[PDB]
């Protein structure tokens, strides 16, 4: 007949530390058993301290992204200030709910800093249900990345361990590892891995390489 949806794959991950937030995603865009492009990162800058990653149906991610952008401009003209990471998250929730009966097939993850300067991460389901987390991943590799983080970043299942804070350095390598391991088992993950780091200084990008197969 005609489906108005497609699965393009790609995963998205994010972690929040005392003073930083990280948002990562592979860069492969596929459909069927093919690859549309190897250079299509799912991370996008919303403000100077808020980044969003979208996975699922690219048609919806694109539309959603442009809707968010416009609404921030509106908020700015209206209140004379930029939107705080928390308000953007609250808004995205209602935007997703407006399509409750014809969902945006999309899994979004917001990574940034809260007004208090600390790191923040919000995860959403296609219709707006959300919450804040220390770290979370969505997308195909979703179930591949998570477990390692529950262990490494959450010190779960480990007896007598040192609950040391996620040093931005250790984080950055955890991110690269799970994505490199995932790139090994999920046919959707591969090509490259772009990371976006959000701190008091701004947003900095880094692109690591992945298997092109």
């Amino acid at each position: 007949r005609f489906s108005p949806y497609v699965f393009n794959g790609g995963t998205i991950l994010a972690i929040a530390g005392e003073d930083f937030a990280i948002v990562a995603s592979d860069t492969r865009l596929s459909e069927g058993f093919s690859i549309h492009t190897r250079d299509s990162p799912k991370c996008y800058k919303l403000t100077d301290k808020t980044v969003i990653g979208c996975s699922g149906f690219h048609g919806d991610c694109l539309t959603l992204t442009k809707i968010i952008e416009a609404r921030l401009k509106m908020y700015k003209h209206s209140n004379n200030k930029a939107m705080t990471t928390g308000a953007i998250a609250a808004m995205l929730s209602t935007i997703l709910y407006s399509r409750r009966f014809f969902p945006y097939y999309v899994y979004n993850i917001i990574g940034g800093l809260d007004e208090e300067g600390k790191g923040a991460v919000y995860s959403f389901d296609p219709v707006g249900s959300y919450q804040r987390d220390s770290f979370k991943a969505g997308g195909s590799a979703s179930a591949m990345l998570q477990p390692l983080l529950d262990n490494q970043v959450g010190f779960k299942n480990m007896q007598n361990v040192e609950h040391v804070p996620l040093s931005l350095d250790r984080a950055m390598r955890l991110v690269k590892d799970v994505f490199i391991s995932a790139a090994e088992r999920d046919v959707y993950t591969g090509d490259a891995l772009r990371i976006c780091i959000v701190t008091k200084e701004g947003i900095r990008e880094e692109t690591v390489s992945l298997r092109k197969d």
Binding site: K66, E69, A70, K73, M74, K76, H77
Partner: protein
């Protein structure tokens, strides 16, 4: 007075008083000035305060990254038009992912504000506008009036006693195009000062500046932020 109350009534002289009256609303508003070099568009305006305990009125508003405006006339109408202008811009970026060409935005204000001037029971928008923007055709300064008419300007000024400012601008036009920002802004501040009673001038409390240009997104300056421009202003009236 049979020809004064409805914009659908032409006078035996081929005029529409309601339109003219609305134009009067502009004249009442405090004066504002606009001018552009070949790389920057600048808006300058004088803000008024009801009483001494009240703040000064906004006169410059942000439309989009490449467009800003100054207003004179009914404030409520300014907000209507501003929001229309903002909406039209958001739509451009949404559909075309590019900023709305300033001249095209001006044509829309022209079409939108013309409609009510021709229908019974409706009234002309009661506000004038100086528009400062920057598109792939460079800097621009437009003027729009209660009559759906609009103008492409080298420099301009509307409002109370704006006749002086116009005069000052008409004298130093040739200079504008090659001015560097701060000089361009000064000419603006200088022209505005022309519209004031000799026994008073520009304060960091009553001046507002708007700048957009190849090197900068439309930005507004209001209080301490205005000092940097006021400094180096020859208190040499002329």
């Amino acid at each position: 007075n049979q020809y004064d109350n409805d914009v659908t009534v032409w006078s035996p002289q081929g005029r529409i008083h309601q339109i003219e009256y609305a134009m009067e609303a502009v004249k009442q508003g405090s004066a504002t000035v606009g001018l552009k070099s070949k790389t920057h568009a600048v808006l300058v305006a004088l803000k008024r305060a009801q009483s001494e305990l009240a703040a000064h009125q906004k006169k410059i508003l942000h439309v989009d990254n490449h467009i800003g405006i100054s207003i004179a006339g009914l404030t409520a109408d300014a907000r209507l038009l501003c929001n229309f202008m903002r909406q039209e811009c958001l739509d451009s970026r949404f559909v075309f992912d590019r900023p709305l060409p300033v001249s095209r935005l001006v044509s829309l204000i022209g079409s939108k504000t013309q409609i009510p001037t021709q229908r019974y029971g409706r009234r002309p928008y009661g506000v004038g506008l100086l528009i400062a923007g920057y598109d792939d055709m460079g800097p621009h300064i437009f003027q729009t009036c209660p009559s759906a008419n609009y103008f492409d300007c080298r420099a301009m000024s509307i409002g109370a006693r704006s006749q002086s400012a116009r005069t000052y601008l008409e004298r130093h036009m040739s200079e504008f195009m090659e001015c560097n920002l701060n000089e361009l802004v000064k000419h603006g501040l200088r022209a505005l000062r022309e519209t004031l009673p000799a026994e008073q001038d520009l304060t960091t409390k009553n001046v507002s500046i708007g700048i957009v240009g190849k090197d900068l997104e439309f930005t507004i300056y209001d209080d301490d932020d205005v000092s940097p421009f006021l400094e180096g202003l020859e208190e040499r009236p002329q």
